[PDB]
Design a protein around this ligand. Structure first.
Ligand SMILES: [Cl-]
Ligand SMILES: [Cl-]
Length: 162
C-alpha cells in the first residue's frame, strides 16, 4: 500500500468528464478540471491539460499521467508550505500518506487552515485529532472517505484500506 494505491481507491478512475460530489467538472483519478459550470470550459481545460483534442475522453495512460503530476504537486505544495512542512517532517511514513491525501483532495490552503488538528497532529495526540477532524464540512460531505483518512492518521496503519 502506498499513496498512489491509496488515492486510487478513494477517487476511482473515470475516463470521461464527470461531476464530483461537489458538482465540479473532473476527470481521471480525481483530477479537477474547473469549478465552472460550463462543460465547454471543462472541455477546454481538458485539452490544454492533455495536449490534444480530446472531446471529453482520455486514455488510462493519459489519466495516470495527470495523477502522477497531481501527486507530485501535492507533495511539493506540502514541502513549501510554512504550515505544512513541519507537520509532515514530524510524521511517520503512513501518516504522511494521509496528509498527502487530504492535500490532494482539498489543496494546501484548505489543509493549511485546519489549525487545531495540525497542532494535535504535531503533538502526536492521535485520538483528539481524530475527533477534531470529524467536525468538519469535509467529513460531513464525504464521510466514508474521511473516515478512512482519519483512521489512517489515528492508527498510523493502512487498515482502513485493507
Ligand atoms: Cl494540469
Ligand atoms: Cl463517502
Amino acid at each position: 500500500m502506498n499513496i498512489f494505491e491509496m488515492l486510487r481507491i478513494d477517487e476511482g478512475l473515470r475516463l470521461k468528464i464527470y461531476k464530483d460530489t461537489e458538482g465540479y467538472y473532473t476527470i481521471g483519478i480525481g483530477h479537477l478540471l474547473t469549478k465552472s459550470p460550463s462543460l465547454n470550459a471543462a472541455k477546454s481545460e481538458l485539452d490544454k491539460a492533455i495536449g490534444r483534442n480530446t472531446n471529453g475522453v482520455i486514455t488510462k495512460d493519459e489519466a495516470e499521467k495527470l495523477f502522477n503530476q497531481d501527486v507530485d504537486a501535492a507533495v511539493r505544495g506540502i514541502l513549501r508550505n510554512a504550515k505544512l512542512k513541519p507537520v509532515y517532517d514530524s510524521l511517520d511514513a503512513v501518516r504522511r500518506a494521509a496528509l498527502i491525501n487530504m492535500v490532494f483532495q482539498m489543496g494546501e490552503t484548505g489543509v493549511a487552515g485546519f489549525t487545531n488538528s495540525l497542532r494535535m497532529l504535531q503533538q502526536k495526540r492521535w485520538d483528539e485529532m481524530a475527533v477534531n477532524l470529524a467536525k468538519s464540512r469535509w467529513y460531513n460531505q464525504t464521510p466514508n472517505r474521511a473516515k478512512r483518512v482519519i483512521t489512517t492518521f489515528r492508527t498510523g496503519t493502512w487498515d482502513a484500506y485493507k
